[PDB]
Amino acid sequence: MKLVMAIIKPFKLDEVREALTSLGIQGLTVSEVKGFGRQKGQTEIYRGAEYSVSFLPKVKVEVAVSDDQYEQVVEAIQKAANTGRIGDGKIFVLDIAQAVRIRTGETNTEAL
Amino acid sequence: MKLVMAIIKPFKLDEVREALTSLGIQGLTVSEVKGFGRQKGQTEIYRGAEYSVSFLPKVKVEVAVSDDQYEQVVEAIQKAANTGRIGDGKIFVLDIAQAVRIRTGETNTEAL
Amino acid sequence: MKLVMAIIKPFKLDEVREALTSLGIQGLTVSEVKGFGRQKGQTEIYRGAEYSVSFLPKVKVEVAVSDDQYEQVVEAIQKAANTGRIGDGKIFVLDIAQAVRIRTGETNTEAL
Ligand SMILES: Nc1ncnc2c1ncn2[C@@H]1O[C@H](COP(=O)(O)OP(=O)(O)O)[C@@H](O)[C@H]1O
Ligand SMILES: Nc1ncnc2c1ncn2[C@@H]1O[C@H](COP(=O)(O)OP(=O)(O)O)[C@@H](O)[C@H]1O
Ligand SMILES: Nc1ncnc2c1ncn2[C@@H]1O[C@H](COP(=O)(O)OP(=O)(O)O)[C@@H](O)[C@H]1O
């Protein structure tokens, strides 16, 4: 099992969710983050230090998938979330050691 | 060491925290997320596309525990966070490669 | 590749970001969390149960770095985020199985 974490442009959430649904992915968890990178927000200089005054929101998508699914999922997300412009974001894949569905106590692949 | 990530119903946070305290777990980190899954929010259809108009908040609990603790922790959380109804959520266990307490520089199990 | 996750005092974000920039780290992702631990917020007791009425915000910094960088990054963060007072937070290092830059499709170390 793999945890697929994608940091994407907020306006790409709907498109990514449809891609996952097409693969029959049953659910996912989403949170708000701020992004720092080559694309930067505006700053105001005070005493030699530049205070950030604008920020770039991103959406963090976390979806647990089986090993047999993960490559297809990463592919779908990349294609859905791509604009070709700077700031498009990242996909990080983390190994999951165990998964449990709280409602049933089902483990691993049967928990998703 | 393991990072135990639980996605739970917001009204179950207090109950989960008490369970962890009973195990002598010293601390944990909590964030707000939105959940998508078999339980769905309401949508409004515009031009063939259904815009989500209601969302289902969940709370993401992240607690780092020692290998000797992790199975007990996962068990406690599952029992505390369970309602038996759809939407109860998931527990994902991730391996931790290193941990540091910022205040002391203590490493691994002594950092918790 | 490693995902370095740091839970830090909010007023330490600027200092940590400068440390990473000094190492030539190109970007990072930041989110808001609440912290529970030895430092606690205030509570109000109702029917034997203590409702939390104040909370301690922390900032979660997540930065993916190469294996050759990770020890230096963990060191920089620890020194930047340290106050010596309780509540300073934690750094957890997670192994990354794969990384992709969404804009280019570049993989692993070339994605950062
Ligand atoms: N090393 C990193 N670790 C974690 N998140 C990162 C890292 N580098 C970039 N990001 C995230 O990716 C987003 C886009 O990065 P950026 O460098 O602006 O564009 P691109 O990803 O197109 O090269 C950033 O806003 C940040 O959220
Ligand atoms: N594959 C997944 N990866 C990450 N989070 C998930 C996944 N599937 C479900 N979730 C999270 O679990 C929550 C509950 O899932 P749901 O399918 O509604 O009910 P149940 O977990 O009882 O089957 C969702 O709101 C979502 O936050
Ligand atoms: N086992 C843990 N897993 C995840 N986060 C933790 C854990 N223990 C502490 N934390 C986080 O670290 C923060 C500081 O912890 P605390 O015990 O108050 O001080 P210190 O880290 O200086 O010992 C907490 O507010 C919480 O966010």
Side-chain angles (χ1 to χ4, degrees), chain A residues 1-17 19-37 39 41-49 51-67 69-71 73-74 76-78 80-84 86-109 111-112, chain B residues 1-17 19-37 39 41-49 51-67 69-71 73-74 76-78 80-84 86-109 111-112, chain C residues 1-17 19-37 39 41-49 51-67 69-71 73-74 76-78 80-84 86-109 111-112:
Chain A
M1 286 174 311
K2 301 281 176 293
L3 186 68
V4 181
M5 183 188 311
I7 307 301
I8 66 176
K9 292 172 166 173
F11 60 84
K12 286 293 210 168
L13 185 58
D14 287 335
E15 198 162 335
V16 171
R17 285 177 59 219
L20 297 176
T21 299
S22 278
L23 294 173
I25 302 296
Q26 306 294 310
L28 63 139
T29 297
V30 167
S31 60
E32 285 168 10
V33 300
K34 287 178 175 80
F36 302 88
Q39 184 180 35
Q42 302 173 72
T43 63
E44 277 178 29
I45 174 64
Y46 297 109
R47 288 187 53 168
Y51 287 44
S52 276
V53 297
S54 82
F55 301 87
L56 291 149
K58 304 284 171 178
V59 163
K60 177 156 83 165
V61 169
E62 289 164 308
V63 54
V65 297
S66 66
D67 290 344
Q69 292 168 321
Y70 105 92
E71 293 198 3
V73 166
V74 162
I77 297 178
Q78 190 275 331
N82 174 270
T83 66
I86 306 194
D88 278 349
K90 310 284 200 258
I91 305 171
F92 303 127
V93 182
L94 273 270
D95 234 319
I96 294 176
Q98 186 177 41
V100 180
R101 192 194 305 277
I102 298 176
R103 177 171 51 94
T104 57
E106 288 172 299
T107 55
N108 291 11
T109 307
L112 312 176
Chain B
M1 286 174 311
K2 301 281 176 293
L3 186 68
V4 181
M5 183 188 311
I7 307 301
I8 66 176
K9 292 172 166 173
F11 60 84
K12 286 293 210 168
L13 185 58
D14 287 335
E15 198 162 335
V16 171
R17 285 177 59 219
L20 297 176
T21 299
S22 278
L23 294 173
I25 302 296
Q26 306 294 310
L28 63 139
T29 297
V30 167
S31 60
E32 285 168 10
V33 300
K34 287 178 175 80
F36 302 88
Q39 184 180 35
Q42 302 173 72
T43 63
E44 277 178 29
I45 174 64
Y46 297 109
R47 288 187 53 168
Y51 287 44
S52 276
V53 297
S54 82
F55 301 87
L56 291 149
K58 304 284 171 178
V59 163
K60 177 156 83 165
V61 169
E62 289 164 308
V63 54
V65 297
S66 66
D67 290 344
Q69 292 168 321
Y70 105 92
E71 293 198 3
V73 166
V74 162
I77 297 178
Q78 190 275 331
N82 174 270
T83 66
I86 306 194
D88 278 349
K90 310 284 200 258
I91 305 171
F92 303 127
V93 182
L94 273 270
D95 234 319
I96 294 176
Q98 186 177 41
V100 180
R101 192 194 305 277
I102 298 176
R103 177 171 51 94
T104 57
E106 288 172 299
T107 55
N108 291 11
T109 307
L112 312 176
Chain C
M1 286 174 311
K2 301 281 176 293
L3 186 68
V4 181
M5 183 188 311
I7 307 301
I8 66 176
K9 292 172 166 173
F11 60 84
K12 286 293 210 168
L13 185 58
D14 287 335
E15 198 162 335
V16 171
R17 285 177 59 219
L20 297 176
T21 299
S22 278
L23 294 173
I25 302 296
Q26 306 294 310
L28 63 139
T29 297
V30 167
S31 60
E32 285 168 10
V33 300
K34 287 178 175 80
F36 302 88
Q39 184 180 35
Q42 302 173 72
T43 63
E44 277 178 29
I45 174 64
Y46 297 109
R47 288 187 53 168
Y51 287 44
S52 276
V53 297
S54 82
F55 301 87
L56 291 149
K58 304 284 171 178
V59 163
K60 177 156 83 165
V61 169
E62 289 164 308
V63 54
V65 297
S66 66
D67 290 344
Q69 292 168 321
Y70 105 92
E71 293 198 3
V73 166
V74 162
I77 297 178
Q78 190 275 331
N82 174 270
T83 66
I86 306 194
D88 278 349
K90 310 284 200 258
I91 305 171
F92 303 127
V93 182
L94 273 270
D95 234 319
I96 294 176
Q98 186 177 41
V100 180
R101 192 194 305 277
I102 298 176
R103 177 171 51 94
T104 57
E106 288 172 299
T107 55
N108 291 11
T109 307
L112 312 176

